[PDB]
Amino acid sequence: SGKIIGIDLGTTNSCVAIMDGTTPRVLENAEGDRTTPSIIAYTQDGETLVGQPAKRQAVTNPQNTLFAIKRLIGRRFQDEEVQRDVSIMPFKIIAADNGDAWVEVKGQKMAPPQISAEVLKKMKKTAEDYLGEPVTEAVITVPAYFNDAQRQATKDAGRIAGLEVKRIINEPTAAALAYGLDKGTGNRTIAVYDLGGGTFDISIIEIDEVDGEKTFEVLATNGDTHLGGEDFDSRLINYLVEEFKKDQGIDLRNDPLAMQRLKEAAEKAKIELSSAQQTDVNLPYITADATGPKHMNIKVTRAKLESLVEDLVNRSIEPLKVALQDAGLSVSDIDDVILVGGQTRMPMVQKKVAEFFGKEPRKDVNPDEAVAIGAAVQGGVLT
Numbered sequence: 388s389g390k391i392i393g394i395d396l397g398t399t400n401s402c403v404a405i406m407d408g409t410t411p412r413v414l415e416n417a418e419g420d421r422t423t424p425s426i427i428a429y430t431q432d433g434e435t436l437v438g439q440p441a442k443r444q445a446v447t448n449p450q451n452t453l454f455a456i457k458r459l460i461g462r463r464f465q466d467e468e469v470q471r472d473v474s475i476m477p478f479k480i481i482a483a484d485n486g487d488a489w490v491e492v493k494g495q496k497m498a499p500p501q502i503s504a505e506v507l508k509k510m511k512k513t514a515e516d517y518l519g520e521p522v523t524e525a526v527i528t529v530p531a532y533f534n535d536a537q538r539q540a541t542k543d544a545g546r547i548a549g550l551e552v553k554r555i556i557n558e559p560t561a562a563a564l565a566y567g568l569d570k571g572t573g574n575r576t577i578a579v580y581d582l583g584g585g586t587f588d589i590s591i592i593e594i595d596e597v598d599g600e601k602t603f604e605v606l607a608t609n610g611d612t613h614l615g616g617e618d619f620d621s622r623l624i625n626y627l628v629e630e631f632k633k634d635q636g637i638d639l640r641n642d643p644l645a646m647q648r649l650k651e652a653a654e655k656a657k658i659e660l661s662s663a664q665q666t667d668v669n670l671p672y673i674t675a676d677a678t679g680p681k682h683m684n685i686k687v688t689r690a691k692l693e694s695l696v697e698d699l700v701n702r703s704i705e706p707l708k709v710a711l712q713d714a715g716l717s718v719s720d721i722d723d724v725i726l727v728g729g730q731t732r733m734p735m736v737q738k739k740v741a742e743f744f745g746k747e748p749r750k751d752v753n754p755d756e757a758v759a760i761g762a763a764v765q766g767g768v769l770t
């Protein structure tokens with residue numbers, strides 16, 4: 388029946404949503420999850436894995452497990468983001484013959500859109516599995532700061548995935564549509580605070596009712612492309628390494644398998660601490676030595692997590708001030724504050740944002756779902 392999907396093609400994760408009549412519905416993937424890791428593995432035996440199945444095999448296949456491709460897409464190999472990433476990514480980043488930032492996978496040169504297209508194919512299949520019918524139309528989101536090359540390379544990923552890309556929309560504009568900030572009257576200035584797995588974006592968006600149609604303008608954009616939830620995980624991981632050093636003599640940083648388990652356990656404990664006051668990190672058989680297997684069992688309070696990440700939360704505030712100054716505005720000129728991204732579910736982040744703007748952020752949608760939902764709302768406007 389010709390159905391247009393909304394896709395959040397995120398740095399860390401991806402989300403796919405749809406109009407179910409008048410109501411947006413985020414879809415569950417083949418693994419039962421409403422979010423799919425933006426991770427693509429080319430296995431030794433010839434399979435292409437995407438999402439949590441690729442995440443599981445990553446430490447067995449570091450060369451051919453790709454992730455963070457949103458950092459490369461539409462960029463040149465000499466871009467400062469790309470040069471920073473060359474020495475930290477375990478997969479091989481290369482210059483194309485035209486100077487573009489490409490990847491080499493099992494000896495094959497590939498452009499970033501060919502890799503991101505595997506994420507988009509999974510979002511497409513995820514929609515087809517829920518609907519019981521083909522899906523070939525999409526709205527896809529990008530950061531507001533993306534230039535024509537990054538937008539066009541994102542379009543190219545959709546085309547390679549077999550999607551007719553009806554429209555590339557800004558992420559904070561999609562978030563405004565999901566929060567229903569179009570079902571209003573007059574002028575409306577909004578702050579979109581977006582804290583994902585890898586990036587922090589602040590966008591100030593003006594929204595005028597004029598001539599019966601609603602205008603949308605990005606007045607200012609700021610942030611930090613190296614501030615996200617993975618950095619919050621890293622603070623908890625480093626705490627868990629040092630407590631296990633103190634209590635059992637072992638530096639777990641030597642054991643790269645123990646470290647894959649510890650990262651996973653730190654993220655789970657962080658996420659539990661958004662709704663509980665304390666949790667346990669319990670990893671049986673975490674490592675072993677001459678005296679046999681060791682077991683990690685460490686209580687983590689929410690207050691301990693908050694102390695480990697406070698300066699990361701405080702880094703998000705200076706780009707808010709600069710964004711307001713570039714827009715020519717004060718906190719009182721902001722009518723609505725919306726949160727986007729899974730890391731904004733943390734009570735400390737919500738409270739710091741509410742405190743800075745002097746108003747409680749809206750609650751209409753999940754922060755981690757807003758970009759995909761708004762892409763779907765925009766798709767339904769074109770249906």
Ligand SMILES: Nc1ncnc2c1ncn2[C@@H]1O[C@H](COP(=O)(O)OP(=O)(O)O)[C@@H](O)[C@H]1O
Binds near residue numbers: 615659
């Ligand atoms: N309830 C939660 N509490 C704290 N952090 C969370 C929670 N849910 C998800 N996160 C974190 O949010 C990040 C995912 O952000 P997300 O918006 O999905 O990424 P993307 O940048 O790809 O849009 C991860 O670091 C994840 O651990």
Ligand SMILES: [Mg+2]
Binds near residue numbers: 398583728758
């Ligand atoms: Mg995001």
